Each structure stands twice: as structure tokens, then as C-alpha cells.
Amino acid sequence: VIQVKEIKFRPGTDEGDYQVKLRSLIRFLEEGDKAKITLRFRGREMAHQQIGMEVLNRVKDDLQELAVVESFPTKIEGRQMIMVLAPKKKQ
């Protein structure tokens, strides 16, 4: 079956650091797992308007090829926000 593995994208994870581990996150998805992004804000229940949805959204948008995301969640639970990412579903 499809497993849950995970990646994180903290703030201060931009292109450099970031898309290196977008490569890591391909890898997760491409094993045939459902790769769960966890944001972990320096922040709160509304940390950001920046932190999350640059990253997350560009992770989707770059990975969009292979993966898509289940939801663009933008409901933070705690000081951290799960964007859930899956294999792109065959219709």
C-alpha cells in the first residue's frame, strides 16, 4: 500500500536548502508513498502569511509533475501546519 512518510519545510528553507529537499520529497512520493509536508513555523496558530504558503505552494508547484497535494490546507494546528501531499491521482 501507500505509506505515510514525511518531509519538513521550516522557515529559512528557501531555494538553496529547499529544492534539494524537494528532491528528497520527490523520492518519498516516488517510492509510492504519501509524502506529508509538515510546516513548523517560527510562529503560532496564525504564524505566517509568508512562511507556509510560499514554501508549501511552491513545493506543490514544483513537484506538481509527479506529486500532487491533497489539500492546500491553510488551517494551522498549533505552531505548525501540515500540508498533506500524495501521489498524483490517476483518474
Structural domains of the chain, with CATH: 1-91 (3.30.110.10)
Sole residue written with cell 498524483: 88
What technique determined this structure? NMR
Q: CB count, 10 Å around CB of 28?
A: 20
> Counting every residue, how long is the chain?
91
Calpha distance 88→36 (Å, rounded):
13
Q: Pairing state of beta strands 3-9 and 33-39?
A: parallel
Residue 87 burial (CB < 10 Å; 0-12/13-18/19+)?
Answer: middle
Q: Please name the residue that has the C-alpha cell 514554501.
A: 55
3-state SS record for the chain: CCEEEEEEECCCCCHHHHCHHHHHHHHHHHCCEEEEEEECCCCCCCCCCCHHHHHHHHHHHHHCCCEEECCCCCCCCCCCCEEEEEECCCC
